[PDB]
Design a protein around this ligand. Sequence first.
Ligand SMILES: [Zn+2]
Ligand SMILES: [Zn+2]
Lengths: 116, 24, 708, 202, 268
Amino acid sequence: TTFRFCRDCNNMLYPREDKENNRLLFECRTCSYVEEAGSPLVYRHELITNIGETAGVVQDIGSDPTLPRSDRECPKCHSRENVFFQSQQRRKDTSMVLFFVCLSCSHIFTSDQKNK
Amino acid sequence: NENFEDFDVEHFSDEETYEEKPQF
Amino acid sequence: SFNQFVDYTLQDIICEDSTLILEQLAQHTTESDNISRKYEISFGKIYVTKPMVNESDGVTHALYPQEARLRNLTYSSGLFVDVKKRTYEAIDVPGRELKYELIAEESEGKVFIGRLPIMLRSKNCYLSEATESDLYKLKECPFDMGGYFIINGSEKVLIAQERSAGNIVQVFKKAAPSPISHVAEIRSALEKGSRFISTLQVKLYGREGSSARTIKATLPYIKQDIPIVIIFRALGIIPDGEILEHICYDVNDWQMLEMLKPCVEDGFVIQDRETALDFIGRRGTALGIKKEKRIQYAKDILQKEFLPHITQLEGFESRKAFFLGYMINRLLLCALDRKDQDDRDHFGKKRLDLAGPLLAQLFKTLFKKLTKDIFRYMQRTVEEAHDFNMKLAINAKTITSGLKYALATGNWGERAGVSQVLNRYTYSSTLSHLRRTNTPIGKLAKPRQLHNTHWGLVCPAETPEGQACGLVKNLSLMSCISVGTDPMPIITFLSEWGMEPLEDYVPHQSPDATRVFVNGVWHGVHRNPARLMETLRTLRRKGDINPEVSMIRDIREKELKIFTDAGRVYRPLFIVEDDESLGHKELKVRKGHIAKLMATEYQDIDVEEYTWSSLLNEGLVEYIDAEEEESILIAMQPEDLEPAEDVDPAKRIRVSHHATTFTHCEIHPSMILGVAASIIPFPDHNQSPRNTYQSAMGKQAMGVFLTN
Amino acid sequence: DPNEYNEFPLRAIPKEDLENMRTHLLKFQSKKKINPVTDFHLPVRLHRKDTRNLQFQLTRAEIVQRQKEISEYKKLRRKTRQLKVLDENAKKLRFEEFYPWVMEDFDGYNTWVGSYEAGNSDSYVLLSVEDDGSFTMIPADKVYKFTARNKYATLTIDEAEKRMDKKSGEVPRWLMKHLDNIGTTTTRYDRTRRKLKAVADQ
Amino acid sequence: EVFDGNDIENNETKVYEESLDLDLERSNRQVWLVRLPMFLAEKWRDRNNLHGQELGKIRINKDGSKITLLLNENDNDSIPHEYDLELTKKVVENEYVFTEQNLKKYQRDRYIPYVKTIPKKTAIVGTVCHECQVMPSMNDPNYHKIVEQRRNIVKLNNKERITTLDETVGVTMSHTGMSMRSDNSNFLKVGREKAKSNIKSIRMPKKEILDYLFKLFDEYDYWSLKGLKERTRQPEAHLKECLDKVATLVKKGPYAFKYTLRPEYKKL
Ligand SMILES: [Zn+2]
Ligand SMILES: [Zn+2]
């Protein structure tokens, strides 16, 4: 969606029509700041979510002792050692595909075969 | 009085369960 | 708990309501009597005597628990406080501000305020310093462990009361017929104040299929549920971008912003701090505020009543706004199904009120009542022109009868079953009763079931078979309850070791900053939390930080939580270090430390005394509660699971877990059991209901409960 | 040691110029850079006044205009009570910060109301660079966050309490753009400009 | 200094010698916002110190913008004398330093000419561009002293235990309740200071007391019983026996329960 805020008063912008060019301009409801819209999409509502499954990955995710270790193949370093976890997005119907984090390059590679 | 941990079920004493659900 | 309550908590209760000021208006018909008198009674240091009894004829002598049990007396000791009387007077000139001065009547002066029942073998009791021969001389059993009170000659034990932890954000999914989908509530409580419980509930209206899903919060002393944007603007945060920055910490999380979009649309027409405060002032429940004072009323509510556990002073609107944004963030995280709702049965989210906190809150109530009576009598004496008697001002029977009644009868007030008659059928029955805990029960949780977090803290099979099954729990053998420490030194240490304060924290410029929580209070952020956690752990393992303090680093959601409060149940665990000499993880405790321990033990039956605190101060063992147990990996056996990897078919099947990243090791797995379950021979070869039946029935056996 | 750098001496401020003068910290909460020497219509006025009922307090330009035009026109009681004892420092802060700092320009173009921040006002020490490169040390005592007020013609509470009523339906997306088009509830700056251009016409 | 705002009377010319406008010419001084540790802020914010003395030197090395403090040896020896000034914000925006000073008090379109403004002499002392924090250098010989001090911050207890009375228990109850000891304190002795006063009034005769009452009625028309009695020092029975003859009491008016002169004598 890429929510936009006014550069003068830092309030959020809202879509508004215009007729002299029939383009998309986001309008500030406070101080009337206008700019061109970079995309015609104004609202997207996802019913199936794929973000948040790899959330929490940091520069020291490997420092967590509770995370299990594996000997799997990192396809950026060819390093066996890595940590892994399930999908962090805690919906009841998510799959049990594993997300692996290499501890030498911090690449997020999965065990999915439907996608791969 | 008495203090016993051997649980004896109080017979004829369903009024505790009747008072738990007095509305339907 | 009792030693903490006597040594420290009594003075804290005295100093909370120490000063009692009475101002007498001049009420001058003529200008010859233009003097206003200000009378102040201030409580100072509190003193406690040794246990003693006053008899009928006024003789007071030392009371020993054997006599107090035989004569049906109460094993109590006197409480004496220092009272200094201040007399201030000023010339009552109207218009001119009054400037009071002393008339040098600063009389001061220990005064008896009541009798505190003394738990046996505590620091005040005579039996603490008594040797075995001294205990035999006093006709006391040396096997008797104390831990109980003697009220009217009855041995009364204070059952530990389990309660939900305070100052924790818990998000709950409400039922389908309710218009509120999720509720994020915090039982905001403060320890160094009035100890009043103010609950702030942040509620999300509308179900999942609904469209107008706004968020309204239940401020105290407000009849309506204010929308969160109006509360944010009332806290000084006007623009929508700053509000969304305070709530959503990731700029790319557009789903959270989409759910926040109806909320900012709802409170759109309020665009100023004063307009928001006056909007809150409209809904004030006092209904005695004039037209123009609603601004100051709303500011006073937001300062002294909205999230009081963070601060009660002024100028801390930014911290309260950040905590409100954190609450809304957790609520939306549960609403977006990124996180599950908070488990009510998590034993780390529970606290156990021992004799310390229970007697503390009871004495707080009784001393507040006593100070009210002192002020009432003093106002009667100054109004009716009677002479002021110091002895009639303080009614010591108030405190004495309050403590005696709440300990003799289990009614904790003016909660039942708090104080029970101590079981004396067998020795193990007395031990099991002295470690018993109780959970009061009407919510939607399942408190009767044995939880995962109950490992090593309460007994897995020791509970009554009746209606108290699971609600009444017994502590495991090594489990201990923290007595609570001051969080001020830890907060001071954190801010001087890189913790950026929450006032100048902007989430978009610090996306990887880790929030720092001390006793549930968000105190700031830290850029490099790993070495901070290492520093904190090295301080605790050497005893600089109190070992009861639990420090939890949640790497996934970037939170560092520190708990110094009382009531946390913890257990000791071995420490597993890197040990680069052996090339693999190993316990810090070695055979030399074991040799020192056995040398001290057999000396007790001349080398240096190597005690349990010697292991605690050298970092060999550590105290882990159920919150910190979520962030560690424990090995069951040292010699089986630490070193890297023909078997006896008679032995049970063991798993090695195929993982060498252990941080701790269990001391012994048999220590997960309680007192009654530790009597069972081979309980791992039994069906668990049979172990529960034996744990119930071990208290009904016959033996020698005491040698005296 | 080689003098390949600059070595600036540091000295404390004398205490003769610390008494009866407090050096607070001023902080504007704005996305854009705010410079009072340029962005503000001089003279500026930083006073400690009541923030209650803004948009109805006339700015210094209209005050001096009204001064000019009026110059041209002329030319049983309770004996005893309980006193809740409180610490003196928090009472002094409550009495001092009862009225917030308000910084206004001449025409009311920039009206900033300052809120007291109590977070780290005691650990801040100011190092003022002197003309000769020396450093003078000033202990900061209070920190204030200043937020802009009435920059976009905010609206009162009576209309607002009308709008939160569910009898009114969806609030229109450009209701106050339309209200500014009508000419109701404008800014202080626009009102002052209207009065100044009306007076200038006579 | 309490004052009234929204003054269209130009009273500030007469009640304030100094100008109320903010002084802005010092706003270009460069100010570094520096955060200090506990010991250094303790020794740099107390008012009994800071007499303009030199507190150290600042070395700014342009190779990596490394800014170091070089404190003088006059203050202490346990604290370090080399500190690493870390810049948490190289450029700081919208942060200014303004002063507060007391003044010289001696010599729609709707408005209200009262806004309760408290005017104070204010001036921008400088502008903040560098937010700094002071960390002691790792290689200083006194850095371990700071580590020990910070460890001692969380080690020592500021609260002492409750004091237990070690004497005989009956000696402590010598003062409590049942006690021969009467209170020698003079606190709230209202009865002592009230029963010591005795107003005694002789029976001086009728003509003189009525002349005195007429003089007092010439002084003031309405009199209370207590006020007239304390003015004349006469017993209430005799004073009433004169007052009913020479005056009357009010029962219903705004001056009720007050003895006032009879209207036959009011004209005289
Ligand atoms: Zn805008
Ligand atoms: Zn890799």
